[PDB]
Symmetry: C2
Subunit: 693 residues, 2 copies
């Protein structure tokens, strides 16, 4: 009794396959029956004969499993294809093909009475098709799986063919839920991991999953690892598995045509992982890894962010290193307002956008270590920083004190670390980190970092932030001495320069042309550098999900945002709360800023966001209104809050009430258009037209 149907049990399953043998149903009937019984909570006695029919049904299901030649079926329908090493992502079978094949195996596996009649057979098929199209661990409430399924057609649930007593119905329904649960959690998942290697995509926008066939995955994995190894990794002998070093598993996550190398730290020790489950020390090691995170890795990460924040408060040069796209827009919006105040109108702009190739991979570790020590260049080796982790004090309702009248798992205990220990931890995470590679036979093939640091370790993210901010400070030190009329900002490896001064623009470009940045682990992607310099007319330039208009600097976010939105939201109240949060989060000040005449653009930005959520609600409304009860008045209150939020934030982020009355009518016109057809929105149209300031 916890969650429901989740997909991470299917992710990242790699096994060499002998299709000649494969059995979908490996465990014994009694063990499978016990698992179904455990899920259903049923505890029958020794003399119960109800599940005799179920036991017979499984035997046929297993019987089809034994007499299925899976190798020919996969090759005949999906087909065996030669590996395409140039484009890794093309090797995956498309989700349309995946659906047609999983149904085929089930059709040969399950006889008609297993499906529970013809009518429920089609209903189950629709549910399976829905399941394959989940996404980022998108788990579905089980009660939607059973909705619409006729209990009568499942004649094997009990000895009687007629449901007569109150107890008879309850047992059949309870057992049926487990049987459906076993079909999806155990049978379907086993099938999915027996044909494909299921991996998450690298896109933070698209949460779709990629189904790489297992035989193709090994060829893809070997080619990319070998190519990556010769440029970033050094192979190590078998003797390195005998000491204490940080370690993690190496995985490949596709982009659009390439992979990204990541190293997920393991919850074990280097001396182990050979593997020996041992049943008991596997959890003690999990605590040992967890206790390492709680009072070593996390306090170091929190203190390092504390050290960086101290620099940010001091130097304006470090202030240019933001940490989100939202921060980038605000500085651009703030910089645009500076031009208007000082000049009246926005002058000509010289724009410079560039990025860094493989910032984590091409990183220079020896330089990083030197800058880490320069953070602590003043204090001695014995300083002893005392820190305690709380959710609101890293990079509200803060109840720290317990006492006997309030706040009565972990209890958050303070941690003390001194200067000498901290620096060695960084050295361990930079040089001593070891990655694991599995070959055809599954041997060691242990590798160590050659150039930079492994992605996915906790301190890796802050290490790049510390080093790159430091690089900007001294390489571009001319900018922050006798500063005048420029905007320089970086997120992680994406850099933007805006300035009306041509000569200063050349100086930054001169730095890019030179190899000065190559001293650090920064290498300029010369093939993806945009430029405006009074000769190319580019009114719109896209940087990081932002359409910034040249010569007015209005900022309009593109389609970089996504509604979650079906998963975890089935109630109207739950969906509304996310939608209200989602709308407010994405309705930022720069979109509503109307210092210029850009009010039509603001309406376009508001209209795109307002219509995205309202149309999303209607799409979910027709499917969840079947069982849930819709309260018209409460939805009206939700409409009032967001409309008020748009009005208040526009006024707050514009320093004037000019144009406020006109903004409200645009919101009202959108609402009436969307909600004029359905009769359930009869009150909504009447009420919305009265919204007045």
């Amino acid at each position: 009794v916890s969650k429901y149907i989740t997909k991470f049990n299917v992710l990242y399953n790699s096994y060499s396959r002998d299709f000649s043998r494969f059995e979908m149903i490996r465990p014994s009937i009694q063990t499978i029956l016990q698992d179904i019984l455990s899920f259903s909570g049923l505890n029958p006695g020794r003399s119960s004969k109800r599940y005799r029919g179920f036991k017979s049904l499984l035997s046929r299901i297993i019987a089809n499993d034994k007499k299925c030649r899976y190798d020919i079926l996969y090759a005949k329908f999906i087909g065996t294809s030669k590996c395409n090493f140039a484009n890794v992502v093309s090797n995956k079978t498309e989700i349309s093909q995946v659906i047609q094949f999983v149904l085929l195996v089930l059709g040969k596996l399950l006889p008609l009475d297993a499906w529970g009649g013809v009518s429920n057979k089609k209903i189950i098929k629709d549910r399976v098709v829905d399941f394959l199209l989940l996404g980022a661990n998108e788990k579905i409430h089980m009660d939607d799986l059973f909705r619409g399924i006729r209990l009568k057609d499942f004649k094997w649930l009990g000895r009687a063919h007629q449901i007569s007593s109150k107890q008879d119905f309850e047992l059949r329904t309870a057992f049926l839920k487990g049987y459906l649960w076993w079909l999806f959690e155990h049978l379907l998942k086993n099938i999915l991991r027996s044909f494909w290697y299921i991996t998450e995509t690298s896109s933070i926008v698209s949460l779709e999953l990629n189904y790489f066939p297992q035989y193709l995955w090994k060829e893809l994995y070997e080619s990319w690892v070998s190519k990556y190894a010769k440029n970033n990794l050094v192979k190590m002998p078998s003797k390195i598995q005998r000491e204490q070093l940080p370690c993690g598993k190496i995985k490949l996550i596709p982009k659009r045509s390439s992979f990204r190398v990541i190293c997920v730290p393991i919850k074990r020790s280097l001396k182990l992982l050979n593997k020996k489950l041992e049943l008991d020390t596997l959890e003690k090691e999990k605590r040992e890894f967890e206790r390492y995170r709680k009072e070593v890795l996390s306090p170091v990460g929190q203190i390092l962010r504390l050290k960086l924040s101290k620099l940010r408060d001091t130097y304006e040069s470090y202030r240019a290193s933001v940490h989100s796209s939202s921060d980038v827009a605000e500085k651009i919006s703030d910089y645009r307002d500076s031009l208007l105040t000082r000049f009246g109108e926005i002058p000509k702009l010289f724009i410079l956008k560039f990025d860094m190739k493989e910032c984590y991979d091409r990183l220079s570790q020896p330089v990083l270590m030197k800058k880490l020590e320069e953070l602590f260049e003043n204090q001695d080796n014995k300083t002893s920083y005392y820190v305690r982790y709380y959710a609101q004090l890293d990079a509200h309702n803060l109840n720290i004190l317990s006492s006997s009248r309030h706040l009565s798992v972990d209890k958050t205990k303070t941690i003390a670390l001194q200067k000498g220990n901290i620096l060695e931890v960084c050295r361990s995470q930079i040089y001593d980190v070891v990655g694991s590679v599995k070959d055809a036979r599954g041997n060691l093939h242990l590798y160590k970092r050659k150039r930079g640091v492994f992605q996915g370790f906790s301190l890796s993210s802050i290490f790049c932030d510390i080093l790159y901010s430091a690089m900007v400070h001294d390489c571009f030190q001319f900018l922050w001495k006798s500063k005048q009329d420029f905007l320089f900002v970086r997120l992680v490896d994406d850099f933007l320069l805006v300035t009306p001064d041509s000569n200063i623009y050349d100086q930054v470009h001169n730095i890019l042309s030179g190899k000065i940045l190559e001293s650090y682990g920064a290498f300029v992607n010369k093939d993806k550098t945009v430029v405006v310099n009074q000769t190319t007319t580019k009114p719109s330039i896209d940087f990081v999900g932002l359409e910034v208009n040249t010569t007015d600097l209005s900022i309009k976010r593109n389609s970089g945002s996504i509604s979650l939105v079906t998963t975890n939201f089935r109630t109207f109240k739950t969906l509304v709360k996310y939608l209200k949060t989602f709308y407010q989060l994405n309705l930022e000040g720069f979109l509503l800023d109307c210092s210029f005449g850009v009010l039509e653009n603001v309406l376009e930005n508001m209209g795109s966001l307002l219509r995205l959520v309202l149309r999303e609600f209607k799409t979910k409304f027709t499917s969840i209104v079947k069982y849930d009860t819709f309260h018209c008045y409460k939805f009206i209150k939700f409409l009032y809050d967001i409309s008020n939020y748009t009005i208040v934030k526009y006024v707050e982020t514009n320093s004037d009430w000019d144009g406020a009355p006109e903004l409200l009518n645009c919101i009202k016109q959108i609402i009436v258009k969307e909600f004029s057809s359905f009769e359930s929105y009869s009150e909504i149209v009447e009420w919305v037209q009265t919204l007045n300031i």
Copy 2:
């Protein structure tokens, strides 16, 4: 429709006095009886004989008033003293003398039956002694005044001497409530204004009042006005009282040995005030003045602050103009952190503290107008700024939209003003303001500004801020071009410079020596300028109520804060709410700063504030627990929030958890000491000792 007992009716009453005649009770008995009846709400008929006893009592009281030689009584007990023009503040009679004399006149005026028996006579005397110690109009709710007064002893309230019927008790209580109100609002106020001129003191820390005798007041008033007139004012003819100009009364507020000139705007029109009470238009004029503030002065004031905020966000020079002592401390702490970050240890500091003589009085209006126009130097004469006043939108729960389902006097309507109109309003408030002077006979004596602007007008406070910030921006423009290692900050007329660079330090002082700043309305107090420059050893320098220690920049607030604290708080819930706000507001980071070894100092600073509020609560507890009900658990909730606030703010304003466990125990030990005696605090001691992190 009435609140309670208010004190502004007594402030600022000046009249030449002929004590030979004076009557405390000038109005007739019937009018006095009506005033009590109107306050009590009683509406007797023509044949009612209930109030016959009261009329007889007044005749004796008035008979004593005529048969009282008031001139000799003041001279024999308080005494007539020669005026001391050198020290103005010494002329006030101390409150100890004031209390002893007001009771004396009451004793000769009121016979025993007026006081309502022996038992109530002392109770009334205690209230009068309590009454004189008000403060900034800190007058007390009536229900506290009547509490404990025995109705039986007031035997003259009705013809019957025994209370028998339900109506008889109510009428006596209602009439007694009115009778008490007339004693304080009419008689006691008349006595206070017939012997002393009651004025607020100039200290923003101490809200104590000074009681200047009226006969001495005229001599003091004439001398200071004439000296001030010859340096800042031009007298005007009687013909100026015939047009529409802003106007206000002129009042003198002592400092330590001199006065500060203020001009309180009147709630009337210039064509009036001759004076003609007229009974009805005095309120129509009151609305007319109020409506001018709501949709003219305030929209101008809000928009003017908006323009300043635009400059503050843009220029670092304008950023130096903070608005509170809290901002000053934060900049010093931030600057101190900058010194540690860049140098390791805090280096030698060159400190410069100076102030401006008569900043508002010696202000230069013609220069002020030029900077006002430079605010609107870009836009044309027809811009039309739209503003709307909301409590959260000047220098949350913002429900702006009304609609037909929600939020259904004034309705807060938007105001539009153009460029030309706004500037003329500022000109009206600067040059056209006319002050009023009352002489011995009460004639015109009308004056207009010659040099600067009058204190106390709403736009005056922001006008100085606009000009002074503008003056800093260009006069010290060298500082904010090629900036390096300095801290410059001003509040209103107090300026501070801290820098380790000798060359930059001399340049600022060179400006002070020269007359460049004399172009504006700034005149440096050369006799009150502190300096540190490797030649003067000044470890401690006081700026604005802050003792900043040289060569470590630690900040320790002195006794500049005060609890309000009795006024507006009678409920336990109300008192707790102010105390929680007061503790959090005054517990600032610098008091909790433990960057140095000053951890014991932090505990003393925390202890001084913690004991200040807890002891204040106990003092109020014994008097308000009589009627209000004390909930121990709710008070514990108040204790938890402040203790949690101290812990979080100390950690936040120290970037470390060092000393946090010891700070909590210091708080715990203070609480047990304060609340160990009273039995009602039995739960408090048990709970506090369990307070743990």
